[PDB]
Design a protein around this motif. Structure first.
Motif, mmCIF file in Angstrom:
data_model
loop_
_atom_site.group_PDB
_atom_site.id
_atom_site.type_symbol
_atom_site.label_atom_id
_atom_site.label_comp_id
_atom_site.label_asym_id
_atom_site.label_seq_id
_atom_site.Cartn_x
_atom_site.Cartn_y
_atom_site.Cartn_z
ATOM 1 N N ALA A 1 0.832 -1.207 0.000
ATOM 2 C CA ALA A 1 0.000 0.000 0.000
ATOM 3 C C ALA A 1 0.873 1.266 0.000
ATOM 4 O O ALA A 1 0.627 2.196 -0.771
ATOM 5 N N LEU A 2 1.895 1.272 0.889
ATOM 6 C CA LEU A 2 2.907 2.358 0.975
ATOM 7 C C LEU A 2 3.705 2.470 -0.356
ATOM 8 O O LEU A 2 4.119 3.560 -0.754
ATOM 9 N N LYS A 3 3.881 1.320 -1.035
ATOM 10 C CA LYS A 3 4.559 1.235 -2.344
ATOM 11 C C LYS A 3 3.652 1.776 -3.464
ATOM 12 O O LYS A 3 4.124 2.445 -4.388
ATOM 13 N N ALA A 4 2.345 1.480 -3.356
ATOM 14 C CA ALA A 4 1.332 1.884 -4.348
ATOM 15 C C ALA A 4 1.076 3.396 -4.289
ATOM 16 O O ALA A 4 0.805 4.032 -5.312
ATOM 17 N N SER A 5 1.185 3.953 -3.078
ATOM 18 C CA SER A 5 0.955 5.376 -2.808
ATOM 19 C C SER A 5 2.262 6.194 -2.929
ATOM 20 O O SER A 5 2.256 7.399 -2.661
ATOM 21 N N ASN A 6 3.377 5.513 -3.299
ATOM 22 C CA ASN A 6 4.711 6.123 -3.485
ATOM 23 C C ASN A 6 5.269 6.722 -2.156
ATOM 24 O O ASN A 6 6.225 7.520 -2.160
ATOM 25 N N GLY A 7 4.675 6.313 -1.011
ATOM 26 C CA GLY A 7 5.128 6.727 0.321
ATOM 27 C C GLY A 7 4.020 7.346 1.173
ATOM 28 O O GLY A 7 4.104 7.310 2.406
ATOM 29 N N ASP A 8 2.983 7.919 0.522
ATOM 30 C CA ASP A 8 1.906 8.662 1.220
ATOM 31 C C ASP A 8 0.942 7.678 1.938
ATOM 32 O O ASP A 8 0.130 7.013 1.294
ATOM 33 N N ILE A 9 1.029 7.618 3.281
ATOM 34 C CA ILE A 9 0.326 6.600 4.089
ATOM 35 C C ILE A 9 -1.214 6.809 4.082
ATOM 36 O O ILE A 9 -1.972 5.846 4.197
ATOM 37 N N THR A 10 -1.656 8.067 3.903
ATOM 38 C CA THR A 10 -3.088 8.423 3.804
ATOM 39 C C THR A 10 -3.710 7.830 2.512
ATOM 40 O O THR A 10 -4.796 7.216 2.544
ATOM 41 N N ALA B 1 -2.347 5.335 0.946
ATOM 42 C CA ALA B 1 -2.193 3.890 1.187
ATOM 43 C C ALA B 1 -3.453 3.304 1.853
ATOM 44 O O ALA B 1 -3.909 2.210 1.476
ATOM 45 N N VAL B 2 -4.014 4.055 2.831
ATOM 46 C CA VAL B 2 -5.296 3.697 3.479
ATOM 47 C C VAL B 2 -6.424 3.658 2.436
ATOM 48 O O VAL B 2 -7.134 2.662 2.343
ATOM 49 N N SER B 3 -6.537 4.755 1.648
ATOM 50 C CA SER B 3 -7.586 4.933 0.616
ATOM 51 C C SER B 3 -7.598 3.758 -0.391
ATOM 52 O O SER B 3 -8.667 3.265 -0.790
ATOM 53 N N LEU B 4 -6.388 3.297 -0.747
ATOM 54 C CA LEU B 4 -6.184 2.213 -1.720
ATOM 55 C C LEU B 4 -6.564 0.843 -1.124
ATOM 56 O O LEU B 4 -7.107 -0.011 -1.833
ATOM 57 N N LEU B 5 -6.272 0.640 0.174
ATOM 58 C CA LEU B 5 -6.642 -0.609 0.877
ATOM 59 C C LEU B 5 -8.147 -0.662 1.174
ATOM 60 O O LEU B 5 -8.756 -1.739 1.150
ATOM 61 N N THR B 6 -8.747 0.511 1.434
ATOM 62 C CA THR B 6 -10.182 0.629 1.746
ATOM 63 C C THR B 6 -11.031 0.681 0.455
ATOM 64 O O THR B 6 -12.239 0.905 0.526
ATOM 65 N N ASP B 7 -10.391 0.444 -0.721
ATOM 66 C CA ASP B 7 -11.093 0.307 -2.016
ATOM 67 C C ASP B 7 -12.126 -0.840 -1.973
ATOM 68 O O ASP B 7 -13.100 -0.834 -2.714
ATOM 69 N N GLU B 8 -11.911 -1.803 -1.054
ATOM 70 C CA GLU B 8 -12.868 -2.896 -0.764
ATOM 71 C C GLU B 8 -14.285 -2.368 -0.373
ATOM 72 O O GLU B 8 -15.275 -3.104 -0.473
ATOM 73 N N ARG B 9 -14.358 -1.100 0.087
ATOM 74 C CA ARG B 9 -15.620 -0.424 0.457
ATOM 75 C C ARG B 9 -15.761 0.950 -0.242
ATOM 76 O O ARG B 9 -16.731 1.670 0.004
ATOM 77 N N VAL B 10 -14.783 1.321 -1.104
ATOM 78 C CA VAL B 10 -14.810 2.588 -1.894
ATOM 79 C C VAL B 10 -15.136 2.290 -3.390
ATOM 80 O O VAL B 10 -15.538 3.185 -4.140
ATOM 81 N N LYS B 11 -15.015 1.004 -3.779
ATOM 82 C CA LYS B 11 -15.217 0.524 -5.176
ATOM 83 C C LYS B 11 -16.629 0.844 -5.725
ATOM 84 O O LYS B 11 -16.804 1.011 -6.940
ATOM 85 N N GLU B 12 -17.602 0.913 -4.798
ATOM 86 C CA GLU B 12 -19.034 1.096 -5.098
ATOM 87 C C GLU B 12 -19.298 2.417 -5.880
ATOM 88 O O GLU B 12 -18.794 3.469 -5.472
ATOM 89 N N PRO B 13 -20.099 2.410 -7.014
ATOM 90 C CA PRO B 13 -20.820 1.219 -7.552
ATOM 91 C C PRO B 13 -19.868 0.162 -8.167
ATOM 92 O O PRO B 13 -18.977 0.495 -8.949
#
Length: 111
Positions: A22-31, A33-45
């Motif tokens: 997640a930290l790798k996907a966000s290029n270091g930005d931990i906030t 990184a959270v948003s990207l992991l919480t895509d499990e509930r942000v993907k909607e619709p």
């Protein structure tokens, strides 16, 4: 270990690799990184979850579908009969009433 601990705490993901990635996907930005992991509930619709219950009555017993159209407009009309009829209709006489060739005829009925 702060970035792993922080992300784990504020996402819920216990897997240490997923936290790094997640930290790798966000290029270091931990906030982010959270948003990207919480895509499990942000993907909607979400993706195509087709709201259609299978019909208990299936009249379509033949699983084999032969879709064979009958739109074969094989008219194949040759230029021969076309130009023959067309020629015959083009040479249509200037006689506009049965047989007016004998306009101003002399019947010669000597009475």
């Amino acid at each position: 270990q702060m970035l792993l601990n922080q992300l784990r705490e504020i996402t819920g993901i216990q897997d240490p690799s997923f936290l790094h990635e997640a930290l790798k996907a966000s290029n270091g930005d931990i906030t982010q990184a959270v948003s990207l992991l919480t895509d499990e509930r942000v993907k909607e619709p979400s993706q195509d979850t087709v709201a259609t219950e299978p019909s208990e009555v299936e009249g379509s017993a033949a699983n084999k579908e032969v879709l064979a159209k009958v739109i074969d407009l094989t008219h194949d009309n040759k230029d021969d009969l076309q130009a023959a009829i067309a020629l015959s209709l083009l040479e249509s006489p200037k006689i506009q009433a049965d047989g007016r060739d004998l306009n101003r005829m002399h019947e010669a009925t000597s009475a």
